[PDB]
Structures are given as C-alpha cells and as structure tokens.
Amino acid sequence: GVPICGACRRPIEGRVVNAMGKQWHVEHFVCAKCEKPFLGHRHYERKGLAYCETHYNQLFGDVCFHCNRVIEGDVVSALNKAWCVNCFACSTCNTKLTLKNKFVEFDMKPVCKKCYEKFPLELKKRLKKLA
Amino acid sequence: SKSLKKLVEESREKNQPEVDMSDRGISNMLDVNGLFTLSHITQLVLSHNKLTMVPPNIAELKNLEVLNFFNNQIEELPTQISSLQKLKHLNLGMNRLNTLPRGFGSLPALEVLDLTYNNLSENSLPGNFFYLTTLRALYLSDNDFEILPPDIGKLTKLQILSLRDNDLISLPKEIGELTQLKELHIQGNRLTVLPPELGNLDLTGQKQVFKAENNPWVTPIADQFQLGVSHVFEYIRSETYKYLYGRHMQA
Ligand SMILES: [Zn+2]
Ligand SMILES: [Zn+2]
Ligand SMILES: [Zn+2]
Ligand SMILES: [Zn+2]
C-alpha cells in the first residue's frame, strides 16, 4: 500500500519519514511552535507531540524547587514556583500536598492549613495585613 | 497513631528513607528509642515538638538530605550539624536560636536554609557562614538583623532571599552580585534607601518577586513604588538617583 501522512492527512509518495508510530512527509514532520521541519534532525517526544531542541526546554523545562533536577512528567505550578507531583509538600511538616489541599502562602512557601494553625498569634495577626 | 518504637523499628526492616515524627510531644531525641541507629534515612521531620536542643548524635544520621526542626524550642545546635554531607534542606524556623555553632557553613551540599522566626542577628552568624555557596534559598525573615554582612555576595546560586520583618537599616550593596536572584522580600524593616547597584537585578518579571512594603522609604522612592516594580529599578539605575545616594550616606 501507501502510508498516510500525519499532518496534511494525504498519502505519501516520496520519502516516508517514520517517527512516533505515524508516518510523515519530509516537510510536515515539524515543531509544534515554530513551523519549520527537522529534515532528519532529531526529535524530542512529549505526549504525542515533538519539538526541536531549543523549544523543548522552554516548555518542559520547569525545575523542581525541592529536588532541583528538571521536572519530567506532571508539573505542579504554585506560588511562582514549580514542583514534581511527588516533591510538592508542606514546607513545615513535609507531608505531601496537592493543589486541591488547603494551604497558605508564607514567604512564597506552601504551608498546610493544619500547620498554619500552630503559628504564633502575634505572627498570624500581622500577616493578614501583608499580601 | 503508631508509638515511637514502631516508627523507629519499622523504618529499618521495611527500609523507609523518610521518618516523620511531627507533632509527637518529644522533649529529647535521646528518648526516641534507637533513633540514631537509623543511619540510612534521608529525611527526618521533627517539627512541632518540644526539643530544647539537638544532641551530637545527629551526626550518625549520615545520609539525611532533609532535616526539619520547625517550631520546636531549640536554643543551640551541636557543631556536628555541619558534618551532614548529604544535607540539602535544613529547616530551623520558629525556634529560639540566637547563635549558630562553630563552622556551620561547612555544609558542602546545603541548598535551602530556613532560619525564620528566631533571635538571630549579624553577630549570631559564624565566620564561615557564607562558605555556604551551594545555597539557593535563604529565609531569614522575623529576626533581629540590623546589618547584613557584605559577604552575602558570595551566595551566587541564591535565587530566594527573605529578610522580611527584620531590623535592617540598610541593604548591603553586594546584593547586586546575586545574579540568579528571583525573590527578594524586605518588607518590614527600617530601610530608607535602596543601593543603586541593586538595579543590576531585574525582578519585574512575573515569576519573580520583590516585596518591600512597610519600610520608612524616602519620598521619591515611595512614589516610584505606587507606579509599580519596574519604575523603582529604573529610578535606582538612574543617575539623578545616584547623586541622591551619596549625599544621603554622608547626611
Ligand atoms: Zn504531509
Ligand atoms: Zn521549535
Ligand atoms: Zn522534584
Ligand atoms: Zn504542614
């Protein structure tokens, strides 16, 4: 038979650039932000998509404030900072949190609600007139 | 619900890296039975207890990367605390530390230090404190710092620095040298003037922070604050501003 491209969705008659299970045309196997193709250059997969080198970082290159290695997989974003889903946790009792937990910004660190309750009243009184 | 014997013994045979003993009313870590045999744990949480001190035995817990003493009542650390060669996260907030021990900056790996809410000041810091050049996050908010040491400039990997609610009459000019700085909290002090060299930092992005409210700033800065973040850094990079600073330091 003839394989069918994955972009224009027409069949391929020339060079068939196999990659990511799908078959492609030479000019249609491309990068997902800048339009241009690889043409034999190397691809960087991510959940069905592919990118060049100097764009693959700008998205999937958030770095986990806890372990400082760059985040592979799901990226928890909170408080102008980023966490691996298993690294995110309370900064004062280190029990794991999700964005669906109740927590409090304290100097841009996450504090679980239970922990905030134990803060000195002097402190809590002053932080409600900050930010 | 488990008692202090099952959490010590089950973390050795089941082989758990992470011990949690948070909010367990411990007054003393030598009472926690066999705690210091656990020489392969990598995380030790003891926040919310009633510790009055950390014993020299902390040193045998060789492979700790996380040590959390938050909200205890510790007046003093043992010099051994600086021998934790794998240590990266140390939390000592809400304690009663007015000093740190000899050679505390000897920690070769430390990345996040948090000393929030103690009785610390510049004299509390040991001489080698700024050999902690691995540090990227340093939280010193709620303390009694009147001057920050010029050597702050050696913490070059620093992205986060909190000095909220201290007693700072001035920022050190060397803060300009912390290229990677993302967050800078200096709310709540007695600052009247930023140092012009601080303009070398661009903290105006959205994933960056510069809080500075509740400071007796001088009126021309006060008014660049109303206009927004970037208008202060512009105005401190200013050359009109520079003539202000020098005639202020001598006044
Ligand atoms: Zn095509
Ligand atoms: Zn690209
Ligand atoms: Zn992580
Ligand atoms: Zn907590």
Residue numbers in the entry:
A (entry chain B): 189 to 319
B (entry chain A): 2 to 252
Article, verbatim:
Our structural results reveal that Rsu-1 folds into a rigid arc-shaped architecture with eight consecutive LRRs shielded by two terminal capping modules, and it engages via its extensive conserved concave surface the LIM5 domain of PINCH-1 in a pattern analogous to some LRR–protein ligand complex formation that is referred to as “hand-clasp”. The superposition of the structure of Rsu-1 bound form with that of its unbound form showed an RMSD of 0.56-Å for the 249 Cα atom pairs, indicating that Rsu-1 retains its rigid architecture, and does not undergo major structural change upon the binding to PINCH-1. The conformation in the C-terminal region of Rsu-1, which is disordered in the unbound form, essentially remains the same structural arrangement as the unbound form, suggesting that the C-terminal region is not involved in the direct binding to PINCH-1. The binding interface is relatively extensive and continuous and buries approximately 2321 Å2 of solvent-accessible surface area that is comparable to those found in the LRR-protein ligand complexes at high affinity. The analysis of electrostatic surface potential of the Rsu-1-LIM complex reveals that each protein surface displays distinct complementary charge distributions and binding architecture at the interface. Two polar residues of Arg165 and Asp166 from the seventh LRR motif of Rsu-1 that are highly conserved across species play a prominent role in the interface, by forming salt bridges with Asp295 and Arg314 of PINCH-1 LIM5 domain, respectively. In addition to the hydrogen bonds and salt bridges, a hydrophobic residue of Phe71 of Rsu-1 that contacts to Phe307 and Thr280 in the PINCH-1 LIM5 domain also significantly contributes to the binding interaction. Our data revealed that the calculated melting temperature (Tm) of Rsu-1 bound to PINCH-1 LIM5 domain (Tm = 67.7 ± 0.5 °C) was significantly higher (11.6 °C) than that in the absence of the protein ligand (Tm = 56.1 ± 0.2 °C), suggesting a significant preference of the interaction for the increased protein stability.
